[PDB]
Amino acid sequence: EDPEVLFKNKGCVACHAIDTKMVGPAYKDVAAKFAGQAGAEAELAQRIKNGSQGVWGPIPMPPNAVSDDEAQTLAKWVLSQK
Amino acid sequence: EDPEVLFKNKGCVACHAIDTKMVGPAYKDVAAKFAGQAGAEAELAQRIKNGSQGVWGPIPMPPNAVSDDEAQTLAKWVLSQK
Ligand code: HEC
Ligand code: HEC
């Protein structure tokens, strides 16, 4: 099997990242940054779906092929990180 | 859909972790630690399959339900992190 496929399928993602510094911000840090903002869930869902740039650094996030509902589910989950 | 399921299925894992500090060591750090050791791939495959404890801290890694071949594939990939 492809190893990235196994990494996801075999539960490793719960406990490990490739790097302490991934290209995008860690979700716990995203959650903390938004702690004083209402409407974080809607904003993040839009960013997740459509892509975004310039908030955390010069590296863009491309759009993601997710539905509105999927984007909202993911935004809520990012915001649920403790 | 479950959000952890979407996180894996929609490609987010390539660019984000939940936390800069996951319970287990980051794979780039594992790769660097083993740079002077022959037989790292076999050692890591065994750790991945069987679990391990006490190398990085007090939190154990439980066994993972992987085949020998899957464990080797994953060990090789961990070691391929740059
Ligand atoms: C899913 C199959 C994987 C893969 C590929 C790896 N793990 Fe873990 N892991 C966890 C912890 C707490 C540790 C440190 C244990 C200690 O201090 O001894 C590890 C360690 C590793 C390593 C490095 C092993 C070494 O001896 O250097 C590697 C390569 C590794 N893991 C890969 C914690 C977890 C989990 C928490 C519940 C889960 C799930 C996994 N690991 C799963 C995987
Ligand atoms: C898969 C569907 C996901 C999810 C759920 C998220 N991303 Fe990304 N992301 C990346 C980068 C470089 C950034 C920073 C962009 C900037 O500086 O503006 C982001 C940002 C985010 C956020 C925070 C958005 C904010 O405005 O604060 C969130 C919640 C987020 N992402 C979730 C990089 C990548 C990728 C690299 C190629 C990929 C793939 C994804 N992101 C995918 C996802």
Binary contact (A73, B27; C-beta < 8 A): no
> What one-character-per-residue DSSP string does B16-65 give?
--S-SS-SSPPHHHHHHHTTT-TTHHHHHHHHHHH-B-SSSSSPPBPP--
| Phi, psi (rounded to 5 degrees) for A52 | -165, 165
Q: Which residue has the tokens 């894992």?
A: B13
Fold assignment, B1-82: Cytochrome Bc1 Complex; Chain D, domain 2 (1.10.760)
Cβ of B32 under 8 Å from any chain A Cβ?
A: no
Chain A residues near residue B10 by CB distance under 8 angstroms? 64-66, 70, 74
Resolution (in Å) of the shown entry? 1.5
